[PDB]
Nucleic acid binder design. Structure first.
Lengths: 50, 459, 51, 48, 50
DNA sequence: ACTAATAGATTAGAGCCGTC
RNA sequence: UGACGGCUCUAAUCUAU
């Protein structure tokens, strides 16, 4: 129910990550942006993080 | 020159709204929809049927890695995946000593011994159910490999395999018992003569432990997953004419119909029994007014109206003398689309490149009242076909009635994920036929129970 | 050094999404603090967020 | 009239007190169960 | 009856442990907070309370 | 009268496997 | 019964000499 004219003013100037229509683009673009922004992380978990 | 029309594969919902397509990974990252506080583990077996659980039961709490997680994925553990407490607590070890078993196993009359072996098990289970204090949610009968090695093919007509009689005798008690085996639960310590065990369950110890955990999960009232495309007010019926060639009279051939409804409450039930065998897998008109009515009585009182459409699946086509009775019992507001599904038609296509089968979801329509659905085959999710060659695409025909064949094709591609017995991408035939068959194997073995529409958990 | 991922979210509801997100984020190897999970008890609730 | 001593009732972790109300309120039950599934019926008003 | 806006200044900033809705979850959060802060403690024994 | 009759047409257990 | 495949071995049934 997030109408674009009702979102916070600081939010609209930034590309929001979509979790509504699927979790798929939710955590992916969370990590995809992290991969492009070189956010620090440790190891790759067990089983190569599955 | 002919083409193969494609329909998209529907997905399956999970915990707090999230909707993935694979049941393998949509459950690990999300968890089951309906959370339950804990499952009490009741186990009965021999001396070797207990230390195996004392190995396995807490083994799936910790994550275990297979050879490769891409093809045989690991699971973080029961608490981390299924959001429940299931450990060595509430254990109801009820030792049936081998000498006690041997004193009943030593009998050679398999027509009598096989019934006797189950009678040793049920009498304890119902006693604990009624005349005891301990509470068990799902019972784990760990029958050793020797018990079902020999007992394999009024109270003796049941099959040589004790699978049917054991579960059919609890219909009076309605306790959900998960039949187990030593081989399926003790893969590590079982070794053959040459040094290579026959059952190579090591790599499957991922999604196999998914099956055991999810089978014990749903039987406790839980909801591991639900379909995210099942339409509203629509009933998906399925009857498999199961042979009642268990007693001395072969005059009985009773089907076990069942339904998978919109709300996720698939109330699998019992059909009607009557003298129609001549070897014809059809039921007389008088009994038809008792099956579909009981099917619809169980739903009209539940929701308050008639179903929108009844997808009556079957491996056997419906004759007019059978379908005519269906007309008066059902209202005209629902179109009874009898989808005779056949897996014996000889259609097999191969690809000029690639060692895999055709991508699933393809629906090669033949005419307005025929189709060919590759519900079994290659997939883009697990990138592995659920078969070894291209199977028969499930011949889908509106045997009686008129409707859009395309609307029919998607729902069969939807009744393939809700397999609350395994952990696969999907099934090759609709669950409206597999779960309608497990009733027949269990229920029709015994002919002295006027059973309610018990769900699959009791079977 | 700035290392914890700040999940600025509503306390009662978005935490459950974060109990999916952060718990997965810990699973992915990311460092996460939240006003529910990593918030130590007995601290200045307004001042701890500023730190 | 010889006096017969008041008996004892056990509670959680094998402990031994004398009041059913007091012991449970402070100690708890012996066996450890996780949750209780409450199949509830009745009239529509009675649900409230 | 004591609203969260009537809390005295000595503990206004301090993250309180909720007990109004349920005493059990407050007791649990008491336990986890002490474990996270490495609060000195002996083995659990309710006989001392008895 | 039905007495057989050999096929098409569909069926399912039911062993035998693999259990990609 | 952990399960979903795959055919295969047998049998059965109705359309018709």
């Amino acid at each position: 129910q997030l109408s674009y004219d009702d979102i916070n003013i600081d939010i609209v100037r930034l590309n929001a990550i979509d979790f509504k229509m699927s979790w798929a683009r939710g955590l992916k673009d969370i990590l995809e942006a992290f991969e492009k922004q070189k956010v620090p992380k440790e190891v790759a978990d067990a089983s190569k993080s599955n | 020159m002919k083409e193969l029309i494609y329909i998209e594969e529907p997905k399956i919902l999970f915990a707090h709204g999230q909707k993935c397509t694979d049941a393998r990974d949509g459950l690990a990252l999300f968890g089951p929809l309906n959370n339950l506080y804990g499952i009490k583990s009741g186990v009965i077996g021999t001396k070797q049927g207990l230390k195996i659980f004392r190995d396995y039961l807490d083994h799936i709490q910790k994550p275990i890695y297979n050879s490769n997680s891409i093809t045989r994925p690991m699971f973080p553990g029961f608490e981390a995946v299924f959001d429940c407490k299931w450990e060595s607590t509430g254990i109801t070890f009820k030792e049936v000593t081998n000498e006690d078993i041997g004193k009943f196993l030593y009998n050679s009359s398999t027509h009598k011994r096989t019934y006797d072996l189950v009678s040793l098990f049920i009498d304890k289970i119902i006693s604990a159910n009624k005349n005891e204090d301990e509470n068990v949610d799902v019972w784990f009968v760990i029958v050793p490999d020797e018990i079902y090695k020999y007992c394999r093919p009024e109270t003796y007509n049941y099959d040589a395999q004790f699978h049917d009689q054991f579960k059919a005798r609890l219909l009076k008690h309605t306790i959900p018992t998960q039949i187990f085996r030593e081989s399926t639960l003790a893969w590590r310590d079982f070794k053959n003569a040459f040094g290579l065990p026959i059952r190579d369950f090591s790599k499957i110890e991922g999604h196999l432990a998914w099956t055991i955990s999810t089978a014990a999960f749903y039987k406790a009232g839980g909801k591991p997953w639900k379909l995210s495309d099942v339409r509203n007010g629509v009933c998906y019926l399925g009857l498999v004419y199961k042979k009642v060639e268990k007693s001395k009279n072969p005059r009985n051939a009773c089907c076990a119909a069942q339904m998978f409804l919109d709300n996720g409450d698939g109330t699998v039930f019992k059909g009607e029994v009557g003298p129609w065998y001549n070897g014809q897998y059809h039921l007389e008109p008088k009994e038809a007014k008792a099956l579909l009515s009981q099917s619809l009585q169980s739903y009209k009182e539940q929701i308050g109206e008639y179903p929108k459409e009844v997808f009556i699946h079957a491996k056997t086509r419906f004759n007019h003398q059978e379908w005519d009775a269906f007309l008066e019992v059902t209202p005209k507001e629902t179109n009874l689309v009898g989808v005779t599904i056949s897996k014996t038609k000889p259609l097999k296509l191969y690809k000029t490149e690639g060692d895999y089968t055709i991508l699933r979801g393809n629906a090669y329509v033949v005419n307005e009242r025929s189709a060919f659905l590759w519900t079994v085959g290659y997939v883009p999710k697990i990138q592995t076909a659920l078969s070894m060659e291209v199977p028969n695409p499930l011949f889908i025909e509106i045997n009686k009635g008129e409707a859009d064949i395309k609307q029919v094709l998607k729902d069969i591609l939807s009744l393939t994920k809700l397999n609350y017995n395994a952990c696969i991408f999907a099934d090759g035939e609709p669950v409206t036929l597999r779960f309608a068959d497990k009733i027949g194997e269990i229920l029709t073995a015994s002919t002295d129970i006027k059973t309610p529409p018990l769900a699959f958990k009791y079977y | 050094m700035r290392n914890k991922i700040f999940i600025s979210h509503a306390t009662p509801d978005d935490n459950d999404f974060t109990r999916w997100l952060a718990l997965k984020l810990i699973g992915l190897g990311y460092e996460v603090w939240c006003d529910i999970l990593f918030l130590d008890k007995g601290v200045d609730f307004w001042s701890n967020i500023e730190k």
